[PDB]
Symmetry: C4
Subunit: 104 residues, 4 copies
């Protein structure tokens, strides 16, 4: 139980240590910027309550997928498709990062 | 085929060897803990039966997603959003771990 | 266009070359075995038509997620949760593999 | 911050550098091709409007999944199942690629 906590602490430290890498900060900022754009787009174009627009943005960008709402306009559908790929681009970016910071 | 069996047993051994790594154990405990917290939350705030709260917590934290349930309260929605990123943080942790074991 | 096809051929060869690795064959067999068990379970316990049981098994095991059907019995719900983790275990296995066969 | 900008530009350059790799180009063309085939298939066999066939093809091949549409024919279901694995095969290809670029 003591080793558990010490390992947890070293791990958390390593995690926060990653919140210092500039390229990671960019990916993060870019992710937040993308989530905001999505929240704005879906509330405006699909008429979703802001909180539901951020929610749809989140489940869509992280690839989790939504099983309750689906864009009704041809405009929302096009945007969502592009939105999915941006999210995949961001994920690869984070993954590439982890891979690089592991083989130095 | 004896080959297939031996190869599988080798892989199983390498797998059990992982469940011995302390960092992997932390990641595992943390997800079980996160899953329990999730179950509690959706039971309370969303009024779901425990088994449905665990189910939703699971399909959500694993990114599988569900096409049947959707949080009704703003609190439940905000929590789900953070829950998802915790899940992603957890997956990256496991992924980073498998990458380290590749050296 | 010629380079394209030559790269495609080298890549395909490399792919088929992976269908020779014994550990990969095991993961594959294990995946097929798991999909069959799932098809049997969901058709039997949830009363799903076989084709719909394999389908649900597939979208669930690959984490794609289903937005039309959800287990109705407490038994199906427990199994699905365990099913999801087996699938994640299989994915990590395949990923660990790719990572190893890249850093030799 | 000039730092942030320079770092982003560096990352963007490294990204464009990827779109120059032949193997990455093949993977990209193959997914666009797979996406088009998917659009054709769901338009024909499932009677979906082209834009809805592309949408479904996209949320399916990317593993995101959809909680609105579900194939009605047995042909559409069997195809979707193979479609998913093609998508996974494609993702592993990109992942394997990013791993190689780590050396
Ligand atoms: Ca999903
Ligand atoms: Na879904
Ligand atoms: Na997913």
């Amino acid at each position: 139980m003591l080793s558990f906590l010490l390992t947890l602490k070293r791990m958390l430290r390593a995690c926060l240590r990653a919140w210092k890498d500039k390229e990671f900060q960019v990916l993060f900022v870019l992710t937040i910027l993308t989530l905001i754009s999505g929240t704005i787009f879906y509330s405006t174009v699909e008429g979703l309550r802001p909180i539901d627009a951020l929610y749809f943005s989140v489940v869509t960008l992280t690839t989790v997928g939504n099983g309750n709402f689906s864009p009704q306009t041809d405009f929302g559908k096009i945007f969502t498709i592009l939105y999915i790929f941006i999210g995949i681009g961001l994920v690869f970016g984070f993954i590439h990062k982890l891979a690089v910071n592991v083989q130095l």
